[PDB]
Amino acid sequence: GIREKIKLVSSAGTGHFYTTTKNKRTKPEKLELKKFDPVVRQHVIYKEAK
Amino acid sequence: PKIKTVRGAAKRFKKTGKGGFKHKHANLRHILTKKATKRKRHLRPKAMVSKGDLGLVIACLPYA
Amino acid sequence: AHKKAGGSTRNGRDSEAKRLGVKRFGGESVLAGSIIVRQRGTKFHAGANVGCGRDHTLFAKADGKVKFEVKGPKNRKFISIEAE
Amino acid sequence: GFEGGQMPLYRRLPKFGFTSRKAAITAEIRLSDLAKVEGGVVDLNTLKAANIIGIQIEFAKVILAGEVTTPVTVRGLRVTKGARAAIEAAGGKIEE
RNA sequence: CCAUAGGUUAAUGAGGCGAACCGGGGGAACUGAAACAUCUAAGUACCCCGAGGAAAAGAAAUCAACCGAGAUUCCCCCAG
RNA sequence: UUUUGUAUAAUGGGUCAGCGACUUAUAUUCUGUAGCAAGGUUAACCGAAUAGGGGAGCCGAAGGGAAACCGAGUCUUAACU
RNA sequence: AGGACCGAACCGACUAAUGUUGAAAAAUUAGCGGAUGACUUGUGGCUGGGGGUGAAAGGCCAAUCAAACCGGGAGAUAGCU
RNA sequence: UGUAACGGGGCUAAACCAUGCACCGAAGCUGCGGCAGCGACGCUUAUGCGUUGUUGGGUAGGGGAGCGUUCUGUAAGCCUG
RNA sequence: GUUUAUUAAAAACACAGCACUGUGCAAACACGAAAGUGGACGUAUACGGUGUGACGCCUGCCCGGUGCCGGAAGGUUAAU
RNA sequence: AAUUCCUUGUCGGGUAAGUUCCGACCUGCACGAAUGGCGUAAUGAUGGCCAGGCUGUCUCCACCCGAGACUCAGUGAAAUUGAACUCGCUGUGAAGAUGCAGUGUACCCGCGGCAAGACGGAAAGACCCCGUGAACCUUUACUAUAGCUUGACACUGAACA
RNA sequence: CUUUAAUGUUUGAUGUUCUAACGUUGACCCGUAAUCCGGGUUGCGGACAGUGUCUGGUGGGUAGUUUGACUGGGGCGGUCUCCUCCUAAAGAGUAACGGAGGAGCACGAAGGUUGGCUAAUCCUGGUCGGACAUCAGGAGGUUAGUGCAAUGGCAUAAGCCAGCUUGACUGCGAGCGUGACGGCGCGAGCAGGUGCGAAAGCAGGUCAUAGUGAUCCGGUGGUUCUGAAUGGAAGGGCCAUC
Ligand SMILES: [Mg+2]
Ligand SMILES: [Mg+2]
Ligand SMILES: [Mg+2]
Ligand SMILES: [Mg+2]
Ligand SMILES: [Mg+2]
Ligand SMILES: [Mg+2]
Ligand SMILES: [Mg+2]
Ligand SMILES: [Mg+2]
Ligand SMILES: [Mg+2]
Ligand SMILES: [Mg+2]
Ligand SMILES: [Mg+2]
Ligand SMILES: [Mg+2]
Ligand SMILES: [Mg+2]
Ligand SMILES: [Mg+2]
Ligand SMILES: [Mg+2]
Ligand SMILES: [Mg+2]
Ligand SMILES: [Mg+2]
Ligand SMILES: [Mg+2]
Ligand SMILES: [Mg+2]
Ligand SMILES: [Mg+2]
Ligand SMILES: [Mg+2]
Ligand SMILES: [Mg+2]
Ligand SMILES: [Mg+2]
Ligand SMILES: [Mg+2]
Ligand SMILES: [Mg+2]
Ligand SMILES: [Mg+2]
Ligand SMILES: [Mg+2]
Ligand SMILES: [Mg+2]
Ligand SMILES: [Mg+2]
Ligand SMILES: [Mg+2]
Ligand SMILES: [Mg+2]
Ligand SMILES: [Mg+2]
Ligand SMILES: [Mg+2]
Ligand SMILES: [Mg+2]
Ligand SMILES: [Mg+2]
Ligand SMILES: [Mg+2]
Ligand SMILES: [Mg+2]
Ligand SMILES: [Mg+2]
Ligand SMILES: [Mg+2]
Ligand SMILES: [Mg+2]
Ligand SMILES: [Mg+2]
Ligand SMILES: [Mg+2]
Ligand SMILES: [Mg+2]
Ligand SMILES: [Mg+2]
Ligand SMILES: [Mg+2]
Ligand SMILES: [Mg+2]
Ligand SMILES: [Mg+2]
Ligand SMILES: [Mg+2]
Ligand SMILES: [Mg+2]
Ligand SMILES: [Mg+2]
Ligand SMILES: [Mg+2]
Ligand SMILES: [Mg+2]
Ligand SMILES: [Mg+2]
Ligand SMILES: [Mg+2]
Ligand SMILES: [Mg+2]
Ligand SMILES: [Mg+2]
Ligand SMILES: [Mg+2]
Ligand SMILES: [Mg+2]
Ligand SMILES: [Mg+2]
Ligand SMILES: [Mg+2]
Ligand SMILES: [Mg+2]
Ligand SMILES: [Mg+2]
Ligand SMILES: [Mg+2]
Ligand SMILES: [Mg+2]
Ligand SMILES: [Mg+2]
Ligand SMILES: [Mg+2]
Ligand SMILES: [Mg+2]
Ligand SMILES: [Mg+2]
Ligand SMILES: [Mg+2]
Ligand SMILES: [Mg+2]
């Protein structure tokens, strides 16, 4: 269970977020993905958090 | 004496129009990253009690 | 001793049966969305009006009558539906 | 609720909701209840005297149930759109 | 040293008993939870003190909700 | 009586007579029956009263939603064929 | 002189037999140990139950003891017969 | 323990193998008489009758219908020196 | 000598002797919510606890663990 | 060896013959120094072994004397018991039969005596297992707690360094 | 700020005395005919000791309890959830302390899409180089490969490579499969907003089947809900999460 839960928070500032897992011993850089924001109903950049 | 309702059951069932009981689905509390979004979306709405379980629920909820 | 103590086995494990197989056979009248066969791999391939799910579950994409057939150069088993 | 020793149904399901204290004091009045009121005007006080609703009731609604056949005034009571159409057709006047 | 403690006498009162009810001071465990420790049984059983024909409580530093009610006690609802 | 199974060498009874074990109160649900019926019924209490009074209340005629709220619709959702 | 020796009363209880619905809910018979001592005995008193007392065996505490007896909680509980 | 490996007597078929016709043989079937449950149909208006088919082993258990005992009203009636 | 009154009298218990240890007296310790009492009208040649068990020859090595005694610089640490 | 499993270890003594006994050896499964080691005169209703005397302990029982047993008169229990017109054998069968099958034998009823059976009588097995049973005991099981101990505050004050 | 000297306050500590609380099972007097007690005087000790509340440690001294099940009796051992195969008798399902193996993950690429590509092994020839490295040809045809067990599947590849990219999307969801139930699984299609492709189209994770934990209790973010006189707020509810 090396992979740990991480939170991806939208850059639109609406407070919505997704959850996933990441291996942090390798690939230590932040994860960025254009994902759908259900509140503003648009695709915005989500940034690593938690 | 009056029959005493099971308060834990009265905090978990609600009576419907025809006399059935509705309940919140299980498996939607604390381990939610690994669960698929389709599965959680189906667990979000309320569900009717099953015919095999109406007997226990009516016994626990006399007044309702 | 009066009795000889035995050993222990190491084979006690097994997994639950997955209820695979053909659900509706030839001639069945099915609604759209009805599951025809539940499979591991594509033992039966999807024909006309039949869809294949992620676990290779063959399901009806239309109302009609199920038909099994053998087609193609490889003599593979296809499931199709005559719309009725 | 005992199931032999496994987790019972009323304990393996989650709790939900809360009991609102406003619902206790809110009541409902049918159109047929209007005709069994004396005075020609429908109020909290007048309905409590006629015994349609309890005395703890602070909020009331008129819903489309039964049939109203007489002109009557409903003042200061929320009324659904179906009841409003029915009351107007029966000739009553509605206001807040 | 005055005093006070102590001593004598006299006057009045109490003592002890009693089935339940009542107020107060102490206060279980079996049992239930299908085990058990929080919890329950239960402030029950029991022990003790006191009083009366009743006792206790009682005349809002009380409720209510922007309307108002008006000490206490008991019964039926509220409401399992 | 207990059992898969008892003539069982498995349990119980020496015999007779008397006694000896599914009750009662309250609450809830279903059935039957009776009254009334979109209504039904009172509780305490009053009453000399099995009468009469007493509708405080409770059940039913509306549901959906966690809830505000809306309402023969409602919830879900930005919106639902 | 002696927790000295032999041995009655007196205190005990090693062996055998009898007895075992006994003469007796622990005795009888024949032997047996101590017998001036850490002995034995009469009368009275004191220690009380999770307590007493115990040259200690979980022994004894009214024919009852790994927690006396009596009354109460109590119709404890008993998925057992 | 005693013949004790046809149930026995006994059997040279009264054994075995074929063929065939008889007969015995159950609470099965049929005949005669009776009772009951269910269904169908007809009639009567029913609250039943008739015809007809069929059913009727039974533990746990479910359903239905009764008998009898003590006491209350009918009953200051009726039975009874 | 004592012991399982009523299936065990023994090699068991006790014992004189030995050692360790506590205790300076309002002693340690014990029975007591407490007052008190025993220890003891005793005072370290006394008293308590523990182990061993006349006497003779002796009682060897280990303080890492648990306990006990002593230390107190530093780390951690309660109510406040 | 009160300790040694292998083990009746091996050697010696005692006996015609000794798994016990005595003395040695040491291969101490698994002795050991105050939960004391080794020895020890005396003592012991203490454990084991040997010898003399003595004998009905025995070879192997015989006889005798008394109390019962046995008979008569009087009084007069008890455990137990579904009912009983209560045989053997072989087989069967809840798998060991007076009762079932086949078969054999057997006139009816007492009294004395024996104890093979009636899975005889007695005690709802004490061994074994089960109960989400009990009790008591132990501990570095859990949770507490009496006690012991630590500090703050209160009873509790003055002055100085 | 490493620092000393010094002013001043507070805090904290220590030691030293004092008497006046408190202790006295020291003496003497009185109540008193009294080894109790109380009062008085005096000596000693002395704000210590002791006690009350709070608090840390210690505490089988005492107390209440727990100490699982399966099991060819129990104990010992082994096992307990999930996946694959056989037993399993050609639908599903099917037991044993039956026979064999695995899982408690991994991957922002190892996912989506477009385009492209096709192995194992052997023979022949070829520098180090050989049985076996890279190369050319041939045979052969999946005897390979699949992130990890086994079964089924895979060439239109589900296997291999590259470009672009985030659909590992949000709200739903006809219908269906599978469970006593809790629940689990499949799913076209609809809406919104996306990615790849010229386009038809494909994409709601991975070739599929293990990689998992109900409820309660809390934590975090948001919220058009509720808010015990009213306006807030705490707390609760809903949604997303631990
Ligand atoms: Mg949540
Ligand atoms: Mg294996
Ligand atoms: Mg469980
Ligand atoms: Mg009313
Ligand atoms: Mg308790
Ligand atoms: Mg208890
Ligand atoms: Mg319990
Ligand atoms: Mg229980
Ligand atoms: Mg009086
Ligand atoms: Mg019986
Ligand atoms: Mg049995
Ligand atoms: Mg049996
Ligand atoms: Mg039979
Ligand atoms: Mg018999
Ligand atoms: Mg019998
Ligand atoms: Mg009997
Ligand atoms: Mg009776
Ligand atoms: Mg009823
Ligand atoms: Mg009725
Ligand atoms: Mg002597
Ligand atoms: Mg005498
Ligand atoms: Mg004896
Ligand atoms: Mg004698
Ligand atoms: Mg002597
Ligand atoms: Mg003597
Ligand atoms: Mg006794
Ligand atoms: Mg006791
Ligand atoms: Mg006890
Ligand atoms: Mg005792
Ligand atoms: Mg009780
Ligand atoms: Mg009882
Ligand atoms: Mg013979
Ligand atoms: Mg016949
Ligand atoms: Mg029949
Ligand atoms: Mg019948
Ligand atoms: Mg004895
Ligand atoms: Mg004695
Ligand atoms: Mg002796
Ligand atoms: Mg000793
Ligand atoms: Mg030593
Ligand atoms: Mg040490
Ligand atoms: Mg030996
Ligand atoms: Mg020899
Ligand atoms: Mg020897
Ligand atoms: Mg040894
Ligand atoms: Mg020791
Ligand atoms: Mg030692
Ligand atoms: Mg010794
Ligand atoms: Mg002696
Ligand atoms: Mg006689
Ligand atoms: Mg016989
Ligand atoms: Mg026989
Ligand atoms: Mg016979
Ligand atoms: Mg014979
Ligand atoms: Mg005889
Ligand atoms: Mg006999
Ligand atoms: Mg005899
Ligand atoms: Mg016998
Ligand atoms: Mg017997
Ligand atoms: Mg159990
Ligand atoms: Mg003293
Ligand atoms: Mg302790
Ligand atoms: Mg304990
Ligand atoms: Mg078990
Ligand atoms: Mg066996
Ligand atoms: Mg085990
Ligand atoms: Mg199959
Ligand atoms: Mg099959
Ligand atoms: Mg892949
Ligand atoms: Mg407010």
Residue closest to D15 by CA, chosen among C79, A38, B14: B14
What is the 3 state secondary structure string of B35-62?
CCHHHHHHHCCCEECCHHHHHHHHHHCC
Specify the DSSP class assigned to residue A3: S
d(CA A37, CA A40): 6
Q: How far is CA D25 from CA C25, D19, D55, D58, D77, in A?
A: 60, 12, 9, 6, 14
**Residues C20, C39 contacting (CB under 8 angstroms):** yes
Is the Cβ–Cβ distance between A48 and A35 less than 8 Å?
no
What does the alpha-carbon distance between residue D67 and residue D86 come to, in Å, rounded to a whole number?
A: 8
Boundaries of domain holding A4: 1-50
**Number of domains comprising chain B:** 1
How far CA C67 is from CA of C32, C49, C72, D12, in Å, comes to 15, 11, 16, 44
Amino acid at D22: K
Tell me the C-alpha distance between D84 and D63, whole Å.
9
* Six-digit token string for D4: 């032999």
Instruction: Please name which of B36, B40, B16 lies closest in space to residue B26, comparing C-alpha atoms.
Output: B40
B32 at interface of A, judged by CB pairs closer than 8 A: yes
Question: Closest Cα partner for D63 from D49, D51, D52?
Answer: D52
As for chain D, the residues directly before each break of C–N over 2.5 Å are none
Q: How many residues does chain B have?
A: 64
Buried b vs exposed e over D47-63: b needs ≥16 C-beta within 10 Å?
bbebebbeeebeebebe
Report chain D's C-alpha Rg in angstroms: 20
Cβ atoms of D32 and D1 within 8 Å: the answer is no
Chain B residue closest to D10 (CA)? B9
Tell me the residue type at B3: I
The CATH code of the domain that includes A3 is 2.20.28.120
Nearest chain D CA: its distance from B22 CA (Å): 11
Chains with 3+ CB–CB pairs under 8 A to D are B
Angle at alpha carbon of residue D65, lines to D63 and D70, rounded to 5°: 95
Resolution for this model in angstroms, one decimal place? 2.9
Provide the CATH topology of domain D21-94: Ribosomal Protein L15; Chain: K; domain 2 (3.100.10)
Please say whether the beta carbons of C82 and C64 come within 8 A.
yes
Output the 3-class SS for C6-33.
CCCCCCCCCCCCCCCEECCCCCCEECCC
- What distance in angstroms lies between residue C73's CA and the mean position of ligand 37's atoms? 109
Q: How many whole angstroms separate alpha carbon D88 and alpha carbon D32?
A: 15
Tell me how far apart the terminal alpha carbons of chain B are, to the nearest angstrom.
17
In angstroms, how far is G35 C1' from A31 CA? 107
How far is CA D51 from its chain centroid?
Answer: 13
Instruction: Report how this structure was experimentally obtained.
Output: cryo-EM
Q: Total domain count for chain A?
A: 1
d(CA C3, CA D85) in angstroms, rounded, equals 93
- The enclosing H or E element of D62 equals strand D59-62
* CB atoms inside a 10 Å sphere around CB D12: 11
Beta bridge partners of B48: B22
End-to-end, the C-alpha distance of chain A in Å comes to 18
Q: Which of A3, A16, A19, A36 is the best substitution to test chain B (most B C-beta atoms within 10 A)?
A: A19
Q: How far is A19 from chain B (nearest CA, A)?
A: 6
Interchain CB distance below 8 Å, B24 and D15: yes
Residue A11 near residue A45, CB atoms below 8 Å: yes
What are the helix (H) ranges across chain D? 9-12, 22-25, 31-35, 44-50, 81-90
- How large is the C-alpha radius of gyration of chain A? 12
Residue D13 contacts B, CB cutoff 8 Å: yes
Q: How far apart are the C-alpha atoms of D12 and D6, rounded to whole Å? A: 9
Strands A4-10 and A42-49 turn out to be antiparallel
- Identify the burial level of B14 via C-beta atoms within 10 angstroms of its C-beta, where 0-12 means exposed, 13-18 middle and 19 or more buried: middle
| Distance of alpha carbon D44 from alpha carbon B25, whole angstroms | 40
* Structural domain that includes position B48: 1-64
Helix or strand (DSSP H, E) at B10: helix B7-10
Q: Where are the domains of chain D?
A: 21-94
Sign of CA dihedral A30, A36, A38, A39: positive
